[PDB]
Amino acid sequence: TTALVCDNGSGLVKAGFAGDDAPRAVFPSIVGRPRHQGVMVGMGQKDSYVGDEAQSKRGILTLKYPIEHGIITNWDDMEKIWHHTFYNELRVAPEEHPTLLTEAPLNPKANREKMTQIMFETFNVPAMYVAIQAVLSLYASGRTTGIVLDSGDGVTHNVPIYEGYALPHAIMRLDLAGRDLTDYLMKILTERGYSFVTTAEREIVRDIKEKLCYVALDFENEMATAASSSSLEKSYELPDGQVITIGNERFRCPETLFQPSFIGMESAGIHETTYNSIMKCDIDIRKDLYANNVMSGGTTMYPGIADRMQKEITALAPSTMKIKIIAPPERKYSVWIGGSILASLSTFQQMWITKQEYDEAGPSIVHRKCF
């Protein structure tokens, strides 16, 4: 019996079977509900739209994200997300397939309680397990030691592991990722004359952020270059046919990852978070940590981020260390791909939470069994 890997991220649900490069269902985690007066009768009008169907008809819908910063708020919407990704995207019964689920660290435990109760009572499985995303990222990296910076759409977390031993006191969580960058890009696109206020326009701002933005190596030199000459300005076409051109906003938007005070937040950037997570570890393993930095998630897909992060850590680390950052082209789905590693492992078959253990222990064995 093949297992299931379902990364339920804040932005994109990535679901599929065991042992694939791409997740079989990659779609944004949105539930659409109509906000206008339906005047035509019949023609297959639906009260809700999930996935790319909501993306297609987004002009006449209000889109809701059931997951915000790794914590699921609306649960009936999350049940609709799971029912759509089981019965329609993958078209398989949940009663005959074990399902590995991912989780951000330092998540509230009631979220684990409710996903265990819903997964064992609404979409009742033979077994399910709740795992950490950074461990799967280190699996997909193909190594054992190293520090992982995961950055999805709600959660950016740093986890250091040495020889298979994670350090739970050194795990750091930062609620700053691509949704906050999309909101900041909405805030700074208003400067050039372009207004985007609705939830349907969030997809357009996210598409602009995905296509045109990049990470600058030196911030102030790129400010001087953008202010002096318009060589950095690039164009984009909206679906209504309008043409926009952006300059410095190509590299002001991801800079909030390296400078969180742009959106008004006290905590430090991702390179200071990486460095402080390194120095919280014991002193002997740090040389192994500096040469094995791992980035995963879609937020580190800008084509300037590895050289900038190397420059910042080499500024922070002492000069006798080789700062090597692993930045594969496959790192957008590597959180899923290491889930293909762990679910296919022969040593993982005894660690699943079965139906019977849930039946004596209630929905509380998931704390003592998982991380």
Binding site: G19, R24, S340, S344, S346
Partner: peptide
């Protein structure tokens, strides 16, 4: 030890890597 001395003198990885190419 004496009966032991008497009785003597007498893959996950390639399986997943094949199927990642299917997408």
């Amino acid at each position: 030890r004496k009966q032991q001395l008497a009785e003597e003198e007498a893959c996950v990885i390639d399986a997943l890597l094949a199927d990642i190419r299917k997408g």
